């Protein structure tokens, strides 16, 4: 669409792949204001608005928050507050032809500066002079919209650029627009930090005999923490068991009698004892021994 009559498309109830936009080549500028330009793709927004227009490169620098320009004042206005990404890619190949292209046009003259996110499509003759235009061309009166001239020979500064502005709004609403995750892979019988559909815990994951109802997602524990989970990709119940924990007790005779000590790890099998994250290996540091032969369960 032409810049003065910029076209707004509402994006909702879908997962937004911003990373594909990042991957896509020929994007001359990808500037995100307020929102982080990368790693905030996952963040959920109530609605996403895409505003589409064709403008010159100088006008492309003009379209930013808190910037004064003719295109800013009389065609498309960007508020300082909004969090959004402005994307521009060079369109010389398809937006230009011989003898100029009249398809894209901009408003030279407007009575007042445009309010943010407001489009004016009025074609009424601009009354710069005190005398009224009367709806016809007159002295001091000119048509509001002047057609852009786009040519293949035309320099890069004057070359047409296609710009899509993405506006993100957060409100008291479901925020269906979001960004998906890679989702990694299932790890079983190993202590791990697990996120299942936004539920976070640290525990060993094992196959679960119990069968949930189809709608049901997670098991119940007294703390309200999960005792079981259902994997989202494959509907298999997984038991959650805590990673091994216990107290460490030093059994020591009196220091006057001896400096020899024994250590009793609590409620742990001796197989887990070597991985006790002792700072030094083969030396009796923090723990009396981990590979010692005097081991009694």
């Amino acid at each position, epitope marked *: 669409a032409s810049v003065y009559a910029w076209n707004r498309k509402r994006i909702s109830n879908c997962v937004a792949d911003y990373s594909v936009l990042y991957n896509s080549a020929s994007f001359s500028t990808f500037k995100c204001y307020g929102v982080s330009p990368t790693k905030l793709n996952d963040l959920c927004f109530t609605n996403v608005y895409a505003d589409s227009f064709v403008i010159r490169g100088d006008e492309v620098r003009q379209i930013a928050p808190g910037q004064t320009g003719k295109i800013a004042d009389y065609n498309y206005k960007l508020p300082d507050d909004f969090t959004g990404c402005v994307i521009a890619w060079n369109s010389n*190949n398809l937006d230009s*032809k*011989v*003898g100029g*292209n009249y*398809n894209y046009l901009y408003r030279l003259f407007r009575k007042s500066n445009l309010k943010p996110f407001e489009r004016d499509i009025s074609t009424e003759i601009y009354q710069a002079g005190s005398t009224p235009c009367n709806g016809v061309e007159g002295f001091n009166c000119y048509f509001p919209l002047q057609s852009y001239g786009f040519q*293949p020979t035309n320099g890069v500064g004057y070359q047409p650029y296609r710009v899509v502005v993405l506006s993100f709004e957060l409100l008291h609403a479901p925020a269906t627009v979001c960004g998906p995750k890679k989702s990694t892979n299932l790890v079983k019988n190993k202590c791990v930090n697990f996120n299942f559909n936004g539920l976070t815990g640290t525990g060993v994951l094992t196959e679960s005999n119990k069968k949930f109802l189809p709608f049901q997602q997670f098991g119940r524990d007294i703390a309200d923490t999960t005792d079981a989970v259902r994997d989202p990709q494959t509907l298999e119940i997984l038991d959650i068991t805590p990673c091994s924990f216990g107290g460490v007790s030093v059994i020591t005779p009196g220091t006057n009698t001896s400096n020899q000590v024994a250590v009793l790890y609590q409620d742990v099998n001796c197989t887990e004892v070597p991985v006790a994250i002792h700072a030094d290996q083969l030396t009796p540091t923090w723990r009396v021994y981990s590979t010692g032969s005097n081991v009694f369960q």
Partner: antibody
Amino acid sequence: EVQLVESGGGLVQPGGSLRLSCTASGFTFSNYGFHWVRQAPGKGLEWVTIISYDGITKHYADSVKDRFTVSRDNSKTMVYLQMNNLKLDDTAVYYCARDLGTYDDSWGQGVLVTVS
Amino acid sequence: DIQMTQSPSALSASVGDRVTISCRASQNIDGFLAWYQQKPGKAPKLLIYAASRLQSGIPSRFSGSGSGTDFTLTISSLQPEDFAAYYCQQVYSAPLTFGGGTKVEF
């Protein structure tokens, strides 16, 4: 839909003045720039002339320059390719195409022009 | 101006056979080229605009490739409708000379 129709092409004597008509329907003629093309028999296409959307600015092919003229009327929605000092080489089927080389491009059916 | 020519001397292949045509410019025209297909006694039909992106109302089999001076169009499968003359023009210069063209044939 965009429909382009051509007329005014017929057998002409060498050196005669022959003027073509490019019909426009189904689109805003004034907004879109217009182009004129010809294809000689058993030859590739040859672009003759272009006219701007307002008709203020015109360019002509080097071979046909100063002998072939182009005019248009916004009210009548027709582009006219006047041809003068016509030659046997000039003989071609003249296709009038709007917005050439773009997505907007449309091609007219064309009218045969013969110089013999 | 930038004079357009066509690389293949001849073009005949049976229905259902992938075919390839080539169009190289004399000077660098960047992405300013349009592919065309003209049937006998018919208006030319612009297969590709900008020479890399398919025109609306054109079958998916036709493809746009190449960048700069070099340009190529590939048809995945042939059909009776497909057989026709083909042409390439450059919009980068105000003087315009089309591509010579070749007649794909059965």
